[PDB]
Symmetry: C3
């Protein structure tokens, strides 16, 4: 089977030992206390779980004899036993790609990677534990952006003048990746280092998204700043603007923000985070109680150059629900209800 059967194994010279095994060992013991309005649902969803986000990966680089740009590849496994999921992950569930790099024009990757917009949403703005609100939270229809996405081509520019970089990507959408749709998206992000500050801007457009009986277009915009000061204080702040248009003329808009404050001293880092989605507006009308927010606190100990220990507490306050354009409830990260979470964890890199 496959594009060339096992011919590579029969005719090519094996490049023995040209790989690296790597892994992130990551365990979070997390107790969730839900307040959904239903005592049984709270008992099911809440309680103590172990969130095992350990993963194994393989990666390598190769200088082909007949081609100047260096070939790069990566295959990274999924989380081996996350909370709320069964055990076991396949290889290739996380960033998994081939590509080429050259110091002059940067790096082009093909495969499964983070979109330029999602990368900024994810880090720094989803940490610590802000992601239920800022990453995959929100009430807007269609697809505000992809996150980790297969069938993508992504270009990461060089760091021009040691100060300015661009990431650009296009790819197939989720249904298109199964031969079940013709959705697609394109995106671009830019970063500018201004001394102790970094400026970020990003865009993503999704097209031909099928949902709630309509076809959707989404456009999402993001601006952010990150900074670190000499007294050990650092911060980030991000503003995010989401627009969606359905094929029946319905328009939706929602915006969001995320901010974080960190104090690093010695082997310790203290962190506070806040994120909110504001009320969704549909066809000029504000939908009441469609906002979300989360406040988070974290203390982290640099127990080793390769590892951290941390404790975290957060409070999620979600929207009360809304209907999509087909008169059914629209799923959001608030569907299961509000909760608080107390957790301790370890992360280790080999």
């Amino acid at each position: 089977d496959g594009a060339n059967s096992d011919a590579a194994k029969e005719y090519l010279t094996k490049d023995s030992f040209s790989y690296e095994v790597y892994g992130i060992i990551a365990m979070q013991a997390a107790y969730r206390d839900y307040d959904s309005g239903d005592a049984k649902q709270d008992d099911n969803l809440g309680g103590m779980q172990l969130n095992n986000e350990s993963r194994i990966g393989f990666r390598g680089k190769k200088q082909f004899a007949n081609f100047e740009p260096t070939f790069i590849w990566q295959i990274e496994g999924g989380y081996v036993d996350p909370s709320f999921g069964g055990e076991g992950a396949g290889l290739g569930e996380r960033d998994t790609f081939v590509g080429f790099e050259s110091a002059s024009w940067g790096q082009v990757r093909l495969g499964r990677v983070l979109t330029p917009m999602y990368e900024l949403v994810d880090w720094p703005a989803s940490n610590p534990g802000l992601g239920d609100v800022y990453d995959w939270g929100g009430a807007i229809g269609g697809a505000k952006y992809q996150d980790r996405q297969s069938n993508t081509i992504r270009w990461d520019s060089p760091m021009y003048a040691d100060k300015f970089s661009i990431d650009a990507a296009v790819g197939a959408g989720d249904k298109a990746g199964l031969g079940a749709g013709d959705d697609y998206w394109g995106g671009i992000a830019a970063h500018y280092k201004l001394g102790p500050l970094q400026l970020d801007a990003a865009y993503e457009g999704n097209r031909n998204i099928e949902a709630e009986g309509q076809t959707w277009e989404n456009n999402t915009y993001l601006v952010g700043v990150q900074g670190w000061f000499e007294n050990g204080i650092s911060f980030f702040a991000q503003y995010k603007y989401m627009e969606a248009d359905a094929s029946n003329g319905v328009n939706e808009k929602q915006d969001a923000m995320s901010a974080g404050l960190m104090y690093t001293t010695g082997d310790w880092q203290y962190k506070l985070g806040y994120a909110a989605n504001f009320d969704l507006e549909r066809d000029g009308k504000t939908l009441s109680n469609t906002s979300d927010d989360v406040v988070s606190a974290q203390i982290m100990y640099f127990v080793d150059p390769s590892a951290v220990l941390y404790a975290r507490a957060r409070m999620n306050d979600f929207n009360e629900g809304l209907d999509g354009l087909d008169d059914a409830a629209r799923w959001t990260s608030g569907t299961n209800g509000d909760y608080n979470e107390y957790s301790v964890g370890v992360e280790y890199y080999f």
Copy 2:
């Protein structure tokens, strides 16, 4: 994505080459002869299969610079192609955990591990081929015990005075691990070395088990002995007592036993095994024909220090069926009918 995204890869110093790849290569060619009472069911269930229980694992240890107890981790894949199943296993389907160890207080593991009770049920008492009766066999409702279980914290004591050790564990149940329940369980085992003998006792309690339209509590108790004699004879014997209470007032009790005899000489080991479940009692009344038993013989050849070859033959005689508390047939390991199995196998450890 995740509790801390890809921050570990970005900010931590990679602890290169600090891992081990290990594996058990295990293949059993097994012919089954079923006598279910339906000739077509016999043809489907029976016949020759290959039972590929090979698996790959990763593990390592790390002395963190700022923390005295040693960090340990393991990620083990599932069986790559077992009999009666499709091919392919993910990483993390078997014992997969992080933990800490210190010579004074032993070892604590968090993740997916064997329960204290199941570890004794599994070894030595399920071997060779006694498991259909003694491990997952039985007629009792609820969950008599978990076996390999995610969302567990397990403490293994040191071997005090070269004689006495304890294993204790608590964890979330199966539905709770999907956010769909609040089942939980706790267990404890103790081992006492009296020269050539070892004494074993174990307990497990499961709570809030949802099954057959009821909520269940289970309590399971186990006592056993194992012995090694230098004329080459070794043996084990176990008695197991299981009780279950449903929320509609039903009580069930069942007990079981397992015994094995071994003669080891040179590169050879002969083994006989026997296990039985006795009649289930429901509400003080014994249910007739709800018992099971199995007799097994095995010859094992130590073909290498790292590997064994073995041949095995066993006869399973199962219960004749019983209803659960929702007036439908209760699934047991006897549902598919009686069978004999003849097999040869290899196991190899790298």
Copy 3:
């Protein structure tokens, strides 16, 4: 759980470092242009995808102290992100076996391997991109052959007199592997190297195949020739004859062929391929328009001893459909409709 619990890990001497990690990094960017007769279906199925056929494997050999023939084993992962599928593959989805080998009598493998017949169908006769027609295409009922198959024992002879080799195999069927049937199959292939030519012949019989409310018997025969000339010209040609007999007395026949021409000069290889399935005959009557064919062109660049780059174009013309013996449509590789495909790709072996 398992035939021997975790006893290997507790009692056997670990053969550390007796393993190899290997991989094929394989990425194909493929644009599909469908002409199915329905514009929506054309839009869903067609478009650009990445076909990531990268996979990771583990393999090794061990000379047992007490056994002459060398022990061999392999565990190979599946495709990490193929087109039309989700991401993630388990270990063991591809060739995964244990076995023994000796220079005198060849090699026996137990586990998941290609059948002798399928190996010739796959390479050379399905390349480049002829497989939709010649590999899993075709309209005949039952199972014309297995491809990669679990529960197999396969014997590969030595190359006698440097000229003649045999592969023979038997195994359980797909439902038998789940204990849901008693299908099985046997096959044999032979190869003869006569100067610049290689001659190939193969047979496979499948029995007790359940499909379309019937039980099927299949017999498939194959003859082929491959040639390599010193001026850089090479070719292959293969003929395939398939017969099937259903348990209600219906008989079916179909034949097929595949041919390819290659010109290799320096670091370049040009390739043209053609394959066709001819009209199916059912109970002596030809069913019109049940034939398929494909024409394909490829240019391949040997970018490295370990890697190739290639570009490829093909046009698939499929049958218009047919009913099975239960009066429902019989699925074939033409069910989704005709299409053209343009692609570029890379393959790399480490």
